[PDB]
Amino acid sequence: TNIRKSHPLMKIVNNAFIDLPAPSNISSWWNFGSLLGICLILQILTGLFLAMHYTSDTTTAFSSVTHICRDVNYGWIIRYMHANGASMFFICLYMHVGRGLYYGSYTFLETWNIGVILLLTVMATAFMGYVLPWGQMSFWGATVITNLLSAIPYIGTNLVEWIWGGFSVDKATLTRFFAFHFILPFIIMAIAMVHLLFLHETGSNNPTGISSDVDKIPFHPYYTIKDILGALLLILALMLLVLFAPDLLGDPDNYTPANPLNTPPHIKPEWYFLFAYAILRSIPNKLGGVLALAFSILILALIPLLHTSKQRSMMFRPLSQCLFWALVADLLTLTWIGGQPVEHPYITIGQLASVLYFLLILVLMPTAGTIENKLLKW
Amino acid sequence: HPQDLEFTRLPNGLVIASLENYAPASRIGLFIKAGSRYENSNNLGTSHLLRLASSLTTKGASSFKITRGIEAVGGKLSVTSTRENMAYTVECLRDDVDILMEFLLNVTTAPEFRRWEVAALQPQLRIDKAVALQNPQAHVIENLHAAAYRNALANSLYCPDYRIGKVTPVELHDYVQNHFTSARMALIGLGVSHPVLKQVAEQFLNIRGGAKAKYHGGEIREQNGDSLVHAALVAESAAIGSAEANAFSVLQHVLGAGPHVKRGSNATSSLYQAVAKGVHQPFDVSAFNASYSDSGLFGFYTISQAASAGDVIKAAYNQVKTIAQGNLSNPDVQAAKNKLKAGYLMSVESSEGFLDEVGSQALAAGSYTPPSTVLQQIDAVADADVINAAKKFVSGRKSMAASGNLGHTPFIDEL
Amino acid sequence: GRQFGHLTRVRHVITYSLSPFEQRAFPHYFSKGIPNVLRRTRACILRVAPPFVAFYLVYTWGTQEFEKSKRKNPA
Amino acid sequence: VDPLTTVREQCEQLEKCVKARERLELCDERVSSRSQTEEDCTEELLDFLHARDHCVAHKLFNSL
Amino acid sequence: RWLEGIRKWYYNAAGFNKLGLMRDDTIHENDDVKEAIRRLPENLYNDRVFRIKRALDLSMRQQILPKEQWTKYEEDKSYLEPYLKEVIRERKEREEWAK
Amino acid sequence: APTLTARLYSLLFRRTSTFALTIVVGALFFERAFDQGADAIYEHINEGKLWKHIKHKYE
Amino acid sequence: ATYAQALQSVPETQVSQLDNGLRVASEQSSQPTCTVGVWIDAGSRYESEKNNGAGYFVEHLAFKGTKNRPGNALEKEVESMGAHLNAYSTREHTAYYIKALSKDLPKAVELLADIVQNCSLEDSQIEKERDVILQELQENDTSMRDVVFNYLHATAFQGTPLAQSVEGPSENVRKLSRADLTEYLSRHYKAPRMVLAAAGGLEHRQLLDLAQKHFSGLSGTETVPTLSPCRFTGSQICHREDGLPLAHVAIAVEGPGWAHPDNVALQVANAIIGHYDCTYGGGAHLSSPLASIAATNKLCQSFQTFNICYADTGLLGAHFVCDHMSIDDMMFVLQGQWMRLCTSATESEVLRGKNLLRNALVSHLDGTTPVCEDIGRSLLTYGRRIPLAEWESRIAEVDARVVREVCSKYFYDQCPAVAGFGPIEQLPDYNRIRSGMFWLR
Amino acid sequence: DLELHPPSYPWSHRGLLSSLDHTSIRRGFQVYKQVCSSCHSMDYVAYRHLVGVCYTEDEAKALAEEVEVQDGPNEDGEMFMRPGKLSDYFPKPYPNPEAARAANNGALPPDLSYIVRARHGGEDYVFSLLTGYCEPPTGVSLREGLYFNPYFPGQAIGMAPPIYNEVLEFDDGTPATMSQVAKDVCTFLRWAAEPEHDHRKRMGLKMLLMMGLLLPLVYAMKRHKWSVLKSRKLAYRPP
Amino acid sequence: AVPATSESPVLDLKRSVLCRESLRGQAAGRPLVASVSLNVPASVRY
Amino acid sequence: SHTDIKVPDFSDYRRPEVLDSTKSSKESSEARKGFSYLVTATTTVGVAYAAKNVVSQFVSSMSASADVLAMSKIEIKLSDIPEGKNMAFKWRGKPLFVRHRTKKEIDQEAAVEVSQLRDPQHDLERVKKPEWVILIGCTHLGCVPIANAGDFGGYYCPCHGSHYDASGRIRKGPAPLNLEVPSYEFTSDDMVIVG
Ligand SMILES: CC1=Nc2ccccc2C(=O)C1c1ccc(Cc2ccc(OC(F)(F)F)cc2)cc1
Ligand code: FES
């Protein structure tokens, strides 16, 4: 008997990274967990190295970020890795969630809900991250988004000024945004460990949605080697962006310093918020729009309750498959519409896409499950 | 230098016998009158524990040293128990007999039986018994004896369930100190000089000293739902050393005492043919013959289908009856003698079996009877003696044991 | 969670396999790979594709509709 | 002497340019003729320049 | 009756039959199904065990069975129904008794 | 003579100690080779455009 | 008189060949009993797929009568002279032998000859022995040890004649006609393929002349059967059957085969690791680290190392029987042992192994029967009896350096064949087993 | 409020592995120096940055020495003016934005350090803007000082056409046409906004090659390990 | 030193008998003997 | 029977070298291992090349940035300072004294007592050229010493009471170590770079 199962630290690593019984048949959509971890560690490192050179003072902030890119040795490659790394994070997140939705992994309730929390935490981190450079889109993005909380009756207006620590997004706001932005990834790392903790209670779902205890394989070597290949593909994607098109997923207006007078033409958040930004602008009323933007993410917590199919995965479920891919294409539409100016036909398209989003999740996909059942005599 | 056996009986009772044969390997055996029979109803299963207990710490060598030291020189240390004797045996290459001898003497003459070691060994009684009782012959033969006797030979070789975990260090000390004595010990050897064995026995085996088996006739029935029924029926035979015992041995081989040919149909076996005449389903039958210092058991053992057990036992019993009635020709008794004569010489063919017979004889009798004298004694059995042995069995008080689904297995008083 | 040897009850299933050093890493990689891919693509295409066709259309319609709206009307 | 104004001429005499240049001249002598209507002709110029400067791009850099 | 055309279509569209699965193999294991599985006789259970083992191995290779070997719609025995029905019927009785 | 892969195995890859030393040595020989080789590819692709090519004009 | 000396005066084995090519071999000593028999280069390896299990079928029919002694006449005669008649068939060796009184050696040799050459093979007797084999095949399914080893061969030497079981598939047992059996016999039972061996009280001269008298008729003359090499494959066979209460695992690397000198050093290494079961006196204090670890931690109920030898190949490894939760840990310590011997075997432990092996083969050759068998088979495998004095020379040559180098050849970084039967859920994945065949240091 | 987006000019650095034409950068710097440094600041570029890019250490020292810059205080407690050095950044035209607005009638000239990165279209955009100045179409007139440029959003910009034929004589004697002046200055403003450009692309090539090597190798290792499972056959054997 | 005829486990499912040819040899004909060792698996004889 | 099981044909998946059922795999065992381990070994070399570069860059990050290297050195013109007079400079946010020394100041600081000094340093090893002494401006509690003053006629401090000679060595005062000799080199006989 070995010192992998015996030693208190190695025991945890042996059970959760070597001898873990994993399904034989898990697809590439199961690699995104690993990749999210890599993203998180990658952000922390690149982030920490950037934090060695950055200053949260409103006057020097933009200058420090540029000083990183010009004077700090390989500061540019660190900087653009961290910025595209944030994009890679969200790509990885949405793929990881999509997997959960399509294959019904959300039945793992605790794992799933901790997921929702993780998503929300990564969002909060990335929102405050984008502010740090103190460019136009940084400042004006932060101003409009934060100020949405003023639409809460009675307290909302106080709340907004309390987050800010003043009367607009200024000195005190940037400094606290830096502090929160530093600490949260570490909180993420902890919550992510709780996430896995719950995941190993059940072990992993698979593409069939049928229990895989009859055909479990050890994690090492099978999935250690796949994860290495996956990681390598993630590095390629990241570095393709960093070394060939670093500004492709950003916005030009974040290269001019923040100006409290000069408003940019079409103020918007970074691409991975655009879907929910579009939902916000569908509703004409402001408090309604905030509650819609809120419910566009929180609805994830509702999904496990909204399950109707007697089958777990969508693999054997044609109607759901189509409605799922409709929901994906709809989200791609909301991201497009989110990027557009508020005009015809983008208002009506946006309204129609937002109605369709909630309709798909709350009405159509539940009904489709029940139709599928009745087609199988169930 | 062509060599035959040497023999010595010391004034203190102890026997030394040794053939120096100049083989590369040397077998040494210390035979002791310390079999299961010398247990009483208070210390049942002590000799079983004692059999498992060599390689526990001794005075001159640790538990660790006994295992390591013997394994170092590629040797073997074995302990063998019958109802009447215990036999402690060592093997090795002839260069290492000194070392192995020291271990043998330590194990037999000064075991410490430490409380923690003895207690730790207790679960081994359960393992050893459990393994052994997978042979259904073990069930029946241990029951058969328990049925057949009131006291000494009735004892089983394996410790009774209730005594497992409960055989004390005191009991082990008592048993050795009371039974492993010069007047009860025979030290046998191959590939070692007789003078050096004598000197070892004088200097290391001079130990000071420390009820007859009443036949009963009973039956014991293990109901267990196997599709096969093992069954043995015996009557009291004669004691080993008496001339009548040789008659039973011949009768055993007239009736049939195990197979000669692989996958063979046993054309000469009186019992097998007697049973196979009536019933053709899977079965086995053999004559059973035990012979001891006090007593003996003779009969037959059947293995039959559950439903056929009645028919098989009755058919086998009938075959002995016709031998007892007088239906027995010379060619049969001649064949039987040739079997037993060949069987005996073949059993002492190996230096393992030879050592067993030299030690075995040395305890139950005065000295060594050569193979030539034994075969002459087999010839000395007249056909009349065989018929008397059979007659004795048929009219003699019966003992029986069975294991299986006994729904069609008769009782003694159903024959 | 649960360790190998406590997962589930399985009876009368034989599994034969080869050492990785006894076999090829890419047996019939194009030969059997290409047809299996086409089969897999055909199997999911008109579940997966139709929504993205619809996106392409709602996109290209909406984009040049925004361009035409910003043009002057001849009246 | 500028290679740019050479190429601008060269490209101006293409089907898509000359058709768009006529569209430009239509509204030139439609607005500048008519009185009191606030419509202008930026749109038509941009139509022309889009077609022109696409061609200019394709081969201007060769002479530089 | 009239929707039997759609049922036959859906069956093949769903396509678990291409992995040699019966409908009752694909049921999401809740506490009732667990109990129902547990109540299956040696034969029905080991069949289930193999069918799934086979299906997962096929899924792992991203392949299906030969069309000859596909579960025919009409040959799909509803093997779990009687056990599952009763497990549910039992629980509903306990739930009722608890009121 | 045994095959080339086999000579590589017996001489370099069999003992894990030699296998590791091989990786370290090979990494060095690879590093200098790859760097110099890939830089050549880059500098030929950008002939006369780099400061390295136009340096001589001002020295 | 020392051990080295004792070996020098062990009775030599006498060696002679007949006109047809049948060898007569014999070790002599004034003994009242003897063993004599016929060993044949024949078995499952020499069988094709359609005649597999014929040699086994023959074995059943061998003692069921002859032309000279029909039915139970052969049987009766053996019994009535107090003779014991026996047979065995391996993948490469069939053998018939008789234990008899020394004075009955003439008749003994006569009867063996009658069995081999003039074997009845009656129509009724065939159809009777057909059901017998089918029932033995069913009995054999309940012996997990037998099943796992048959599996090891089946996977190790897959797609060759060595993958084939001695008994043959039930398919062949049910179909094999008397034509098949007689054709098998005349092809394989030939004088140069056979050896007549005897031990005990026998004048070598007399045996050779008795061989003339009864075995002269043996044929010794297209496509002479010559076994091809057999391809070893690194493979796994996993018969998962949770209904059985203990798991049987058998694992082996490719062994060198009968001929090779390395076999001696391999025996030394195998003796170091040794064997164990739950009834052993040793327990915690045992010398073998695998055994002491296995005893203290209740890993297995039993294990043995085995170096099975065939012609140009073999199976070198171990078999174990253990609790359903112990398979991974058993594999770990066992493979750990192979690695430790490859890399870092010590002088004193090799000396222990040597001493075990010395003792092993000196005491195994005890009594006429095992000595007769050693004569019979050594002539088939080696082409001579190797004297004990020569075995000792080969053993004394083995030191720590040898054990390392020899073990490293066969075990280290090599693909094993794995067979598992029973509740084998835990049994390590082949890759994990294959990775366990090397150390990273 | 219609929009005319710029066309894609085939720059010497347009491609994946294509570096900047440094000679172009050297000319382009002088286009900033002679023309746009009296209106636009370029705060993030110092005289040292030019070294090993477009000028030698010695040339860049001369360029630095040419300019006035404030330094202090001295021991007396006063702010003096001194000749520039490599460590000095490019000097701002005005002391502050408020001064800048006054000199250009309300409109503030943007800093040029990031102008390529800070505008959609980049060097394509700037080139189109500089060469795109033309007479207004019918029905159009702006505030006196706002010129017509079609590429500018809202069709009207507050910058006087800054480049024309022979606005500057180049050090290497390249014929200074309006087009050539614009091409060079854009190439410089590209480097200004993204100094890393060449190193970045050098790394891109080395990454693509290593990925070309490692991906199939890692993939082969994957298939190797997984081959045990890919081959395997299952048999169901009930009694 | 030499391993026994039969390797011994507890809790190991029993080896079956189906015919006359396998069942002969089994009927006990002499009284029990039991051996235990250091090296050899424990055996019980008729 | 279990004898009815025969292993499936693996020919489709086998390596060429192990296809022949009548030949020994042991020929190709040396080779088949070699091929697979080469792939592994190559991969490790590639990953090593990567990790080297990635780690190396990150380590580089923490080292002095381009603008800090820009203030590392200061150029001083030697013909711009007359013989006898001191000239102060701003170097690494500190004053930096360069002093043209006369043939009198050279010989006067040459034959000074070696032992009597608190910090024993001879003049030949405090400077690289005889007529130029370069020093960083007080070692005790940090002030800026005033040139052409003091008892020993070099540098004097109005803070506590230190007296430095013309070679920059402490003679009479509370300072523990002499004014510090920085790292420098003369490039052209007209110019000096300090740093
Ligand atoms: C734990 C896992 N369970 C699984 C279960 C089923 C299917 C796949 C997997 C995995 O791929 C998987 C895993 C994930 C990640 C890694 C590398 C790694 C990267 C970052 C980490 O930091 C932290 F924040 F803790 F997440 C930790 C580990 C290796 C393996
Ligand atoms: S502070 Fe100037 S010497 Fe003390």
- Cα within 13 Å of Cα(J10), Cβ side: 35
By CB neighbour count within 10 A (0-12 exposed, 13-18 middle, 19+ buried), where does G292 fall? middle
Atom index in ligand 2 nearest the CA of residue J141 equals 1
Taking the C-alpha atoms of residue A326 and residue A307, their distance in angstroms, rounded to an integer, is 18
User: Is H228's Cβ below 8 Å from some Cβ in J?
Assistant: no
Question: What is each CA distance from B199 to B204, G148, H127, H134, in whole angstroms?
Answer: 8, 52, 119, 132
Instruction: Find out whether G291 and G302 touch, Cβ atoms under 8 Å.
Output: no
Got the DSSP string for G325-385? TSHHHHHHHHHHHHHHHHHH--HHHHHHHHHHHHHHHHHHS-SHHHHHHHHHHHHHHTSSP
CA of C36 to nearest chain J CA: how many angstroms apart? 17
- Find the catalytic residue in J2, J100, J160, J163: J160
Taking one residue from A and the other from G, the number of pairs with CB-CB distance under 8 angstroms is 17
Give the pair of three-digit tokens for residue B388.
Answer: 């008397």
The Å distance, Cα J176 to ligand 2 centre, comes to 10
Taking the C-alpha atoms of residue A268 and residue A264, their distance in angstroms, rounded to an integer, is 10
Got the DSSP string for chain J? -GGG--PPP-TTTB-GGG--TTS-THHHHHHHHHHHHHHHHHHHHHHHHHHHHHHHHHHHHHSPPHHHHHTT-EEEEGGGS-TT-EEEEEETTEEEEEEE--HHHHHHHHSS-TTTSSS---GGGT-SBTTEEEEE--TTT---PEEEETTTTEEE-SSS--EE-TTS-B-SSS-SSPSB---EEE-STTEEEE-
- Find the catalytic residue in A7, A200, A286, A310: A200
Closest ligand to residue A122's CA = 1
- Find the catalytic residue in A251, A270, A330, A372: A270
Every domain of chain I and the residues it spans = 1-46
Give the pair of three-digit tokens for residue G15.
Answer: 């060696």
The CATH number of J11-62, from 4.10.410.60, 1.20.5.270, 3.40.50.620, 2.60.120.330, is 1.20.5.270
Every domain of chain C and the residues it spans = 1-75
Taking the C-alpha atoms of residue A108 and residue A119, their distance in angstroms, rounded to an integer, is 16
Ligand 2, atom 4: closest residue by C-alpha: J160
Tell me the structure's resolution in angstroms, rounded to a single decimal.
3.5
J96 lines ligand 2 (CB under 6 A): no
CA of J54 to nearest chain G CA: how many angstroms apart? 26
Question: What is each CA distance from H145 to H1, H156, H169, in whole angstroms?
Answer: 20, 10, 28
Atom index in ligand 2 nearest the CA of residue J138 equals 2
Instruction: Find out whether B265 and G76 touch, Cβ atoms under 8 Å.
Output: no
Query: What single-letter DSSP state applies at residue G43?
Result: S
User: Is F51's Cβ below 8 Å from some Cβ in H?
Assistant: yes
Taking the C-alpha atoms of residue E8 and residue D62, their distance in angstroms, rounded to an integer, is 67
Using the Cα atoms of residue A361, residue A366, residue A372 and residue A373 in order, give the sign of their dihedral. Answer: positive
Three-state secondary structure call for residue B291 = strand
Instruction: Find out whether B298 and B288 touch, Cβ atoms under 8 Å.
Output: yes
Instruction: Find out whether E26 and A311 touch, Cβ atoms under 8 Å.
Output: yes
- Find the catalytic residue in A227, A251, A330, A372: A227
Residue J125's contacts (CB-CB under 8 Å, 6 or more residues apart) are: none
Taking the C-alpha atoms of residue I28 and residue I34, their distance in angstroms, rounded to an integer, is 14
Which secondary-structure segment (H or E) carries H219? helix H197-231
CB within 6 Å of ligand 1 — which residues?
Answer: A 16-17, 22, 26, 30, 33-34, 37-38, 40-41, 189, 192-193, 196, 204, 223, 227
Question: Residue A316 pairs with which residues in a beta bridge?
Answer: none
Taking the C-alpha atoms of residue B315 and residue B359, their distance in angstroms, rounded to an integer, is 39
The Å distance, Cα A16 to ligand 1 centre, comes to 8
Q: Are strands J132-136 and J86-91 parallel, antiparallel or unpaired?
A: unpaired
Name the residue of A38, A88, A223 whose CB sits within 8 Å of the most ligand 1 atoms, as the mutation to test its pocket.
Answer: A223
**Strands of B15-19's sheet in order across:** B6-9, B15-19, B185-190, B25-32, B86-93, B76-81, I33-36, I43-45
User: Is C26's Cβ below 8 Å from some Cβ in G?
Assistant: no
Using the Cα atoms of residue B334, residue B339, residue B341 and residue B342 in order, give the sign of their dihedral. Answer: positive
The Å distance, Cα J69 to ligand 1 centre, comes to 42
Ligand 2, atom 1: closest residue by C-alpha: J141
Q: Establish whether chain H is in contact with chain C, requiring a minimum of 3 CB pairs below 8 angstroms.
A: yes
Chain H positions in Cβ-Cβ contact with residue C70 (cut-off 8 Å)? 1-3
Ligand 1, atom 21: closest residue by C-alpha: A37
Closest ligand to residue A202's CA = 1
Chain F positions in Cβ-Cβ contact with residue J31 (cut-off 8 Å)? 2-3, 5-6, 9
Give the pair of three-digit tokens for residue B105.
Answer: 């003497």
The beta-carbon neighbor of F26 closest among J31, J33, J45 is J45
- CA C65 to chain centroid, in Å, comes to 33
Taking the C-alpha atoms of residue G277 and residue G295, their distance in angstroms, rounded to an integer, is 8
Using the Cα atoms of residue G280, residue G284, residue G287 and residue G289 in order, give the sign of their dihedral. Answer: positive
The beta-carbon neighbor of G234 closest among C4, C14, C21 is C21
Cβ count within 10 A of residue H83: 12
The Å distance, Cα F55 to ligand 1 centre, comes to 51
Using the Cα atoms of residue G214, residue G218, residue G220 and residue G226 in order, give the sign of their dihedral. Answer: negative
Ligand 1, atom 11: closest residue by C-alpha: A34
On whether the G3-216 domain is CATH 3.30.830.10, my answer is: yes
Residue H17's contacts (CB-CB under 8 Å, 6 or more residues apart) are: F42, F45, F46, H201, H204, H205
First CA to last CA distance, chain I: 23
Taking the C-alpha atoms of residue B283 and residue I26, their distance in angstroms, rounded to an integer, is 10
Got the DSSP string for A126-158? HHHHTTTT-BHHHHHHHHHHHHGGGGSTTTHHH
Got the DSSP string for G138-157? HHHHT-HHHHHHHHHHHHHT
* Phi and psi, residue J154, nearest 5°: -155, -85
Chain C positions in Cβ-Cβ contact with residue J12 (cut-off 8 Å)? 27-28
Instruction: Name the closest residue on chain D to residue C74, using Cα atoms.
Output: D39
Contact C16 J7 (CB under 8 A): yes
Contact H52 F51 (CB under 8 A): yes
Every domain of chain H and the residues it spans = 1-195, 196-239
User: Is C45's Cβ below 8 Å from some Cβ in A?
Assistant: no
Instruction: Find out whether F22 and H19 touch, Cβ atoms under 8 Å.
Output: no
The number of folded domains in chain E is 1
User: Is A218's Cβ below 8 Å from some Cβ in G?
Assistant: yes
Question: What is each CA distance from G411 to G162, G273, G406, G407, in whole angstroms?
Answer: 21, 14, 9, 6
Residue numbers after which chain J breaks, C to N beyond 2.5 angstroms: 137
Atom index in ligand 2 nearest the CA of residue J175 equals 3
Taking the C-alpha atoms of residue G138 and residue I12, their distance in angstroms, rounded to an integer, is 18
Chain J positions in Cβ-Cβ contact with residue A70 (cut-off 8 Å)? 66
**Cβ under 8 Å to D: C residues 12-71:** 71
Residue G33's contacts (CB-CB under 8 Å, 6 or more residues apart) are: B342, B345, B346, B349, G99, G100, G101, G102, G200, G201, G368
* Phi and psi, residue G428, nearest 5°: -50, 145
Q: Which amino acid is at A240?
A: L
On whether the G235-436 domain is CATH 3.30.830.10, my answer is: yes
User: Is E48's Cβ below 8 Å from some Cβ in A?
Assistant: no
Taking the C-alpha atoms of residue H99 and residue H83, their distance in angstroms, rounded to an integer, is 24
Taking the C-alpha atoms of residue D4 and residue H114, their distance in angstroms, rounded to an integer, is 27
Could you give the angle at which helices E4-14 and A318-338 cross, rounded to 10 degrees? 70
The Å distance, Cα A243 to ligand 1 centre, comes to 27
Taking the C-alpha atoms of residue F30 and residue J44, their distance in angstroms, rounded to an integer, is 11
User: Is G431's Cβ below 8 Å from some Cβ in H?
Assistant: yes
Instruction: Name the closest residue on chain J to residue G421, using Cα atoms.
Output: J2
Got the DSSP string for B26-57? EEEEEEES-SGGG--TTSTTHHHHHHH-BTB-
Residue of G75, G138, G248, G278 best to disrupt the I interface, most CBs of I under 10 A: G278
